[PDB]
Design a protein around this ligand. Structure first.
Ligand SMILES: Nc1ncnc2c1ncn2[C@@H]1O[C@H](COP(=O)(O)OP(=O)(O)O)[C@@H](O)[C@H]1O
Ligand SMILES: Nc1ncnc2c1ncn2[C@@H]1O[C@H](COP(=O)(O)OP(=O)(O)O)[C@@H](O)[C@H]1O
Ligand SMILES: [Mg+2]
Ligand SMILES: [Mg+2]
Lengths: 141, 370, 370
């Protein structure tokens, strides 16, 4: 969004008139540096290339999930969305680091839910139900 | 140390040195070494036995002149080391080589040993942090503010046409001939000897160069002016005497447009340009004819642009828009481009760092020059 | 449920894309990928190593041209992915591919793996909600508005006669040969070489293609025009030079009716049409002869209709009326047919849904297409 704002400012009449005036004075240092040294074109290309992966990420469904089946479905949605990386040129190492971060969020959410469950206090069959649900979540992962 | 990089347009006749970001080359001077010809006899005479820069021009008659490089190729490397040291002296740039990256320039299609030895001199004799040896057509295009064009650079030692389209150089269309301002000045000296004026000393050769710069022109067409036998013109020598130039005024700079006047089986400057254009792809030819950029001092001859336009029109197809762009700063277009290039943050990615030179050596500069 | 379906007639020569319901394909561009072949030297040059669409045509002299399709078969699938990405870019269709069903077209009797890989690309990379690989000829007939006839579609890569009865393409009467417009342009390049005018570069093959599109015709009597003295019409090349064509003007499109001129022992285009008609039912032959519909770009040669009518009359039975229809929208007839088909509500029942491909794979397209 910030790069789109900068690009919209760059196309405004004031900037173009300034560059035209500097060109007419043969002050090509500033104009060439503005065209090339900004890095705005490369940054725009990179963020636009990354946008399909970042657009409408379902991570909120994982963060708002309060039940283990909801966490499992949110993980399904997150990985189905991560399958969109093929269309982009995202770094694969960066993708693995994103998967690390998603694992961190999954661990935090599971810890929160199990803290609300109070596993040791409840009877054994309920504990087994919660355990098989959690291990189904891990198998889904 | 990442101070302002030092741009050195390393011309064969004139060296133009300055810091990157300056609008113009602040320190320009002729590219020769003068040595005292006569015998030192008095206490308190001129100090030093090597005169470079305006000190050599002030005492030109006292000195024997040697040019370190011919046709863009360095023949004497000790003299070139001395001149590049003088570029850093207290008179010129008042700085230390260790603290500034250097942007050097050389003619296209030059020998590889020249580039290797230049990098060796700039990394070993001078402990420069970073070096970048650049071709000159790109700098002409930077200085004139285009990305597309065919740069016809005619300097003191080398003439060459380089076509570039949208910032892409065509390395196989680059035309080069070794006929330039120094050859024209030698031919003018020969013609002046054929008038009756013998200029056989080296300072007298500098006087011949001044004659060429001052009183010489290119006729729009050679045949009618040759057959007319116009009157002679008076040129005042440095010592006060006068000389009658006559046909040497225009027959001398015609060497650019027909090198066969000295027996060279080479191409004219117009043929160099047209061959560079026509060796390009078929679709780029019309765009290249409309964007011709002149550079170098030898393109400053009176009536040069008109004759070149007529010749290119004779050689180009019918009804093709030929438009030759001839900026006022043709002499310093290459340096102004080098200054524009060296001021960019992208320039940090182009040079050869010192440690990178130690790792590879000549290979690093050979890869990163192109 | 999804957005309006996107019709993509991907020919070997030019891709034609748009949204269903448009009168004409608004987004047509040549089906090749251009890559710069020269050395980028300066900052501010053209960005990107892949040039597709009008950006490839504007800088055509700068690029090596690669065709992904050959004879209706994708030979380079990375380039095909690039081109179909460009179809969805901000320059064409301005939309995301995850929202619009696709109606791709494929030439008859193509390899099965071609259709399978195309569906895999469209369902995995582009994540389309639905897909429907159609056939070009039946769409062209739908565009004409008729339900029964013969479509003789002659494109850049493949020419084929397909008879259709009440909207159903008879599959055992389809005739196809791989001699098409690109083969005619290669033959024209060979003949221009035999006339002294030599083109090598992939960018100059587009100049040859332009020469074919501009100055080439089909003579009604090849042997009569062969023996007579030629006129030698002159063609102006992009650089401004001229070339005298002469006998190559009409012998180049002769390849469509006589493949043996390049040593291929395959049927001619007239033979393709007549054998497609005569391979069908004896009851349908009269109405198939009375309903012939031309399509594709290669049917636009001057005098194509008269020549094909003469050949078909030579091969057809007597007392059979022959009516070759040559609609004005021959280039976009198949796309207009795809748009007409995709507008119908029945098209919802035709596509392979994304879930169907996910659960079945190539079998889903294999049953649904046929
Ligand atoms: N006004 C002029 N008319 C003709 N020749 C000139 C003029 N000014 C300079 N020159 C010639 O140009 C040459 C210097 O050109 P320059 O741009 O220094 O080339 P390089 O960079 O290769 O040394 C000198 O040899 C000189 O003779
Ligand atoms: N006016 C014309 N005359 C002759 N040939 C043409 C003309 N216009 C286009 N073509 C040829 O037709 C081909 C494109 O036909 P098209 O129907 O687009 O094929 P496809 O079915 O592969 O898209 C090109 O190769 C071109 O050479
Ligand atoms: Mg120079
Ligand atoms: Mg087609």
């Amino acid at each position: 969004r910030a790069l789109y704002r900068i690009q919209e400012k760059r196309e405004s009449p004031e900037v173009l008139l300034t560059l035209d005036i500097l060109k007419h004075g043969k002050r090509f240092h500033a104009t060439v540096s503005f065209d090339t040294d900004t890095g705005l074109k490369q940054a725009l290309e990179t963020v636009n290339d990354y946008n399909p992966l970042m657009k409408d990420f379902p991570l909120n469904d994982l963060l708002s999930a309060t039940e283990l089946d909801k966490i499992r479905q949110a993980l399904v949605a997150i990985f189905t969305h991560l399958r969109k990386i093929r269309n982009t040129k995202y770094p694969i190492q960066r993708a693995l680091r994103l998967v690390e971060a998603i694992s961190r969020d999954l661990s935090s959410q599971l810890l929160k839910v199990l803290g609300t469950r109070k596993l040791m206090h409840v009877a054994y069959e309920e504990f087994e139900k919660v355990m098989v649900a959690c291990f189904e979540v891990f198998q889904t992962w | 140390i990442a101070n302002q990089p030092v741009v050195i347009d390393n011309g064969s006749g004139v060296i133009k040195a300055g810091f990157a970001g300056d609008q113009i080359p602040k320190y320009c001077f002729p590219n020769y070494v003068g040595r005292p010809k006569h015998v030192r006899v008095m206490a308190g005479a001129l100090e030093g036995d090597i005169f470079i820069g305006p000190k050599a021009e002030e005492h030109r008659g006292l000195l024997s002149i040697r040019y370190p490089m011919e046709h863009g190729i360095v023949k004497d490397w000790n003299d070139m080391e001395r001149i590049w040291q003088y570029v850093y002296s207290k008179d010129q740039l008042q700085t230390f080589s260790e603290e500034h990256p250097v942007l050097l320039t050389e003619a296209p299609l030059n020998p590889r040993k020249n580039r290797e030895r230049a990098a060796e001199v700039f990394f070993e004799t001078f402990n420069v942090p970073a070096l970048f040896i650049s071709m000159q057509a790109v700098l002409s295009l930077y200085a004139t503010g285009r990305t597309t064009g065919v740069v016809l650079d005619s300097g003191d030692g080398v003439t060459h046409a380089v076509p570039i389209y949208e910032g892409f150089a065509m390395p196989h269309s680059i035309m080069r001939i070794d006929i330039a301002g120094r050859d024209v000045s030698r031919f003018l000296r020969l013609y002046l000897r054929k008038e009756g004026y013998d200029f056989h000393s080296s300072s007298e050769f500098e006087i011949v160069k001044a004659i060429k710069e001052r009183a010489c022109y290119l006729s729009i067409n050679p045949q009618k002016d040759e057959t007319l036998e116009t009157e002679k013109a008076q040129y005042y020598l440095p010592d006060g005497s006068t000389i009658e130039i006559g046909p040497s005024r225009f027959r001398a700079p015609e060497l650019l447009f027909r090198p066969d006047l000295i027996g060279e089986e080479s191409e004219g400057i117009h043929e160099v340009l047209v061959f560079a254009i026509q060796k390009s792809d078929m679709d780029l030819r019309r765009t290249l004819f409309s964007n011709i950029v002149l550079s170098g001092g030898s393109t400053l001859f009176k009536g040069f642009g008109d004759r070149l336009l007529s010749e290119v029109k004779k050689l180009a197809p019918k009804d093709v828009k030929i438009r030759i762009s001839a900026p006022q700063e043709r002499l310093y277009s290459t340096w102004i481009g080098g200054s524009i290039l060296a001021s960019l943050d992208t320039f940090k990615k182009m040079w050869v760092s010192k440690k990178e030179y130690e790792e590879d050596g000549a290979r690093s500069i050979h890869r990163k020059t192109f």
